[PDB]
């Protein structure tokens, strides 16, 4: 009866059902155009203490990471803000500074939006991006190797470091926090993905979770080798220092804003920090070190 008593899958299965819509990172519309939306709500995604500028940058970067994962380039953006009437004007000004910087970087732009009073800060972004070839979650192919960009787990260690509310942090800890607060979309993988990926997508719910969506969505079965997983130096250090398993972070790190794509091994780029972690074969599910694994 209540949204909470319904669970994860349950809610979306009803909406899609209600509308009877198979399209609910982006939605592909013809003209192609990639339509995307994301939300950052105070209390959940960030705190009012985090520098506004980084939140402004993130607002644009999250949407760009979805457009990018589908082989498209970010073009236009609509930013809707729910702000408490007693919010510092400087907060909003710094927020839009970060937004301007993200747009300058990714080469997209804000064209509109509106403001509404609210008990808490709610950030809702809309982004439109064009593509000459839609690359999604089903295109996988038998024989395909499985790659991921960058490293995994960083964003998770950073959120935990933030939750510790330390006064200051060591550098290795800062780089981790920055990866979670001011992430950079792999807009540098567009050419590669819009040209060689058979299957692609942004790792937003964590490796294991999204590799399933991948496997399921293309009737294929994926095999990943834990000791191939790209691990960063600060995640290693963070782990040793707070005694944890780097791997548990790479497999279940939630959103990392890195790409998870597939294509024949022959196509690795001489310039991208691409890392093969497994292979696409047979059919049905995802496996790690040989043992089936689920979220």
Which amino acids are annotated as binding site for ATP, given as ranges?
Answer: 96, 113-114, 137, 204
293: closest CA among 284, 11, 269?
A: 284
**What phi and psi, each to the nearest 5 degrees, are found at residue 38?**
-145, 160
**What is the closest distance, in whole angstroms, from the C-beta atom of residue 258 to its own copies in the complex?**
20
Work out which of 60, 68, 73, 87 binds its own copies, going by CB under 8 A: 87
C-beta of residue 185 within 8 angstroms of C-beta of residue 257: yes
Q: Which stretch binds its own copies (CB under 8 A): 104-112, 148-156, 167-175, 211-219?
A: 104-112
Contact segment (CB under 8 A) with its own copies among 46-54, 74-82, 164-172, 285-293 equals: 74-82
Within 10 angstroms of residue 212's Cβ, the number of other Cβ atoms is 17
Sheet of 258-263, strand order: 202-203, 258-263, 145-148, 275-281, 221-224, 286-288, 291-292
Q: Does 226 bind its own copies (CB under 8 A)?
A: no
**Cα angle: 258, vertex 29, 131; to 5 degrees:** 50
Q: Quick check: 4 binds its own copies (CB under 8 A)?
A: yes
Tokens of 207: 């490796």
Which position has the token pair 């490293």?
A: 151
Closest approach of Cβ 106 to its own copies, in Å?
Answer: 14
Q: Which residues bind its own copies (CB under 8 A)?
A: 1-6, 11-12, 14-15, 18-21, 23-24, 26-27, 29, 31, 33, 35-39, 41, 44, 75-76, 78, 80, 82-90, 92-93, 96-97, 99-100, 103, 109-120, 122, 124, 126, 128
């Amino acid at each position: 009866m209540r949204l909470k008593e319904l669970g994860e899958f349950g809610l979306i299965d009803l909406i899609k059902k209600t509308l009877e819509s198979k399209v609910i990172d982006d939605t592909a519309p013809v003209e192609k155009l990639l339509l995307t939306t994301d939300v950052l709500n105070e209390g959940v995604h960030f705190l009012r203490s985090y520098i506004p500028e980084a939140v402004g940058w993130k607002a644009i970067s999250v949407n760009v990471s979805d457009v990018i994962a589908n082989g498209g380039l970010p073009k236009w953006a609509l930013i809707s803000l729910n702000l408490p009437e007693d919010l510092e004007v400087s907060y909003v000004e710094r927020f839009y500074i970060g937004v301007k910087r993200a747009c300058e970087f990714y080469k997209c732009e804000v064209v509109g939006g509106n403001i509404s009073k609210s008990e808490k800060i709610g950030i809702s972004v809309f982004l439109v991006g064009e593509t000459e070839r839609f690359v999604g979650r089903d295109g996988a192919r038998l024989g395909d190797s499985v790659f991921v960009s960058g490293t995994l787990g960083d964003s998770r260690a950073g959120l935990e470091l933030l939750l510790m509310e330390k006064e200051e942090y060591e550098p290795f800890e800062l780089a981790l926090i920055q990866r979670h607060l001011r992430p950079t979309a792999r807009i540098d993988y567009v050419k590669h993905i819009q040209k060689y990926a058979n299957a692609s997508m942004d790792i937003s719910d964590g490796l294991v979770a999204d590799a399933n969506h991948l496997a399921q969505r293309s009737g294929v079965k994926i095999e990943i080798l834990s000791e191939k997983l790209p691990l960063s130096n600060e995640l290693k250090m963070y782990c040793e220092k707070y005694g944890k398993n780097p791997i548990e972070y790479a497999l279940f790190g939630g959103e990392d804003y890195q790409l998870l794509f597939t294509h024949p091994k022959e196509r690795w780029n001489p310039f991208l920090d691409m890392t093969e972690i497994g292979r696409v074969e047979e059919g049905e599910g995802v496996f790690v070190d040989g043992k089936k694994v689920e979220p």
